[PDB]
Amino acid sequence: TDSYIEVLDGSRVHPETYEWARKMAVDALEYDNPAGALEEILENPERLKDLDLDAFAEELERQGYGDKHITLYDIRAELSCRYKDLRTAYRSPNTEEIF
Amino acid sequence: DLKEVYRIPKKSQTEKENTTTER
Q1: Which pairs count as long-range contacts for A13-18, CB under 8 Å and 24+ apart, including other chains?
Q2: Integer angstrom CA distances of residue A1 from A4, A5, A88
Q3: Helices (H), chain A
Q4: Helix, strand or coil for residue A45?
């Protein structure tokens, strides 16, 4: 209608971590626009592999959010191929299955 | 000069060379 749609809605990343995801995208591009940086990282995910997430997790722990190593790594893996079907690939029934 | 907010830094060369052997 007349509102901007947050691109991360299509991804995982609970809405309580949109600010963290935006900051991670802005820092990976090594900028000094949140949405533009997010849209660029979504298409150039190779730049997220060089970012240090352990330092960010330590920063979060020192700020007062508790342990977030796994949460941040999950957000990074999400930026890389938003919602990737974790289900096992299709396989043809083997001999015993067919029998 | 000092109003710069925290910035998520990049990994060191040691980490970039070591962690690359894990997947």
Answers
A1: A13/A75, A13/A78, A17/A71, A17/A75
A2: 9, 10, 38
A3: 18-28, 34-43, 53-63, 69-79, 95-98
A4: helix
Which one-letter amino acid corresponds to residue B4?
E
The distance of B17 to chain A (nearest Cα, Å) reads 11
- Please give the method by which this entry was determined: cryo-EM
Instruction: Give the C-alpha distances (Å, rounded to integers) separating A90 from A85, A99, B6.
Output: 12, 19, 45
> Entry resolution in angstroms?
3.1
User: Residues 1-23, chain B: which have Cβ within 8 Å of A?
Assistant: 6-12, 15-16
- Enter the DSSP assignment of A21: H
Q: For residues B3 and A15, give the distance between their C-alpha atoms in angstroms, rounded to a whole number.
A: 27
Contact A78, A58 (CB under 8 A): no
Q: Do B15 and A52 touch (CB under 8 A)?
A: yes
